């Protein structure tokens, strides 16, 4: 199990524009196109991101290319953020993947607002961080996914993702 396989489980794969859990236009493996309500705006962002006139449908190879770019961007965003980088440097490799998962979903700014949970993680107070992480909009809106991520932080294993 690694971050690419975990995210593919948590986000799925769709080759035509769809709306994500918040109603935003999305394609591929969790690639957010726009927060605007205009499907025409969304198709134009897709054409810009892929480099051709798509009409709303991409290939699998195109979706994997977007996914590689987005996982790379999430890692580089953590390592440039002054609240996230010391947490990331303190964790083992499995818990680092859990942090990249959150950043992929919510963005670097949103994860950096979990001030109290990040402090617990840095202190390795796993059970107390798990409770604090669940007191969040993220957990109430996507509880099955948030539970898998929170279990990964609690245990340091990939158990929440095997059997899927």
User: Where are the strands (E) in the chain, listed by range?
Assistant: 14-19, 25-28, 31-34
Q: What are phi and psi of 64, to 5 degrees?
A: -65, -40
Distance from C-alpha of 29 to C-alpha of 13, rounded to nearest angstrom: 5
Structure tokens given for 66: 């977007």
Closest CA to 158 of 105, 95, 101: 95
Closest CA to 51 of 69, 35, 37, 39: 69
Which uninterrupted H or E stretch holds 100?
helix 93-112
- Structural domains of the chain, count: 1
Give residue 140's domain range.
Answer: 3-161
Closest CA to 94 of 67, 115, 121: 121
Structure tokens given for 55: 């009409």
Paired strand residues for 64 = none
Measured in whole angstroms, the distance separating CA 134 from the mean position of its chain's CA atoms is 16
Q: What is the resolution of this structure in A?
A: 2.1
Distance from C-alpha of 18 to C-alpha of 27, rounded to nearest angstrom: 6
Instruction: Show Cβ contacts of residue 16 under 8 Å, excluding neighbours closer than 6 positions.
Output: 27, 56, 57
Catalytic residues: 11, 20
Distance from C-alpha of 143 to C-alpha of 137, rounded to nearest angstrom: 9
CATH number, domain containing residue 127: 1.10.530.40
Distance from C-alpha of 40 to C-alpha of 113, rounded to nearest angstrom: 32
Distance from C-alpha of 32 to C-alpha of 120, rounded to nearest angstrom: 30
Q: How many residues does the chain have?
A: 164
Question: The tokens 């993220």 sit on which residue?
Answer: 138
Closest CA to 64 of 11, 1, 142: 11
Is the separation of the CB atoms in 36 and 19 below 8 Å?
A: no
Paired strand residues for 27 = 31
């Amino acid at each position: 199990m690694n971050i690419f396989e975990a995210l593919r489980i948590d986000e799925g794969l769709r080759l035509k524009i769809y709306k994500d859990t918040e109603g935003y236009y999305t394609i591929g493996i969790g690639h957010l196109l726009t927060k605007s309500p205009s499907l025409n705006a969304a198709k134009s962002e897709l054409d810009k991101a892929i480099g051709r006139n798509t009409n709303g449908v991409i290939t699998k190879d195109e979706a994997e290319k977007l996914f590689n770019q987005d996982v790379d961007a999430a890692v580089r965003g953590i390592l440039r953020n002054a609240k996230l980088k010391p947490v990331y440097d303190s964790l083992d490799a499995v818990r680092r993947a859990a942090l990249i998962n959150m950043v992929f979903q919510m963005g670097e700014t949103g994860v950096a607002g979990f001030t109290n949970s990040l402090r617990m993680l840095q202190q390795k107070r796993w059970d107390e961080a798990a409770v604090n992480l669940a007191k969040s909009r993220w957990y109430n809106q996507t509880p099955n996914r948030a539970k898998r991520v929170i279990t990964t932080f609690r245990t340091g294993t990939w158990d929440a993702y095997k059997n899927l």
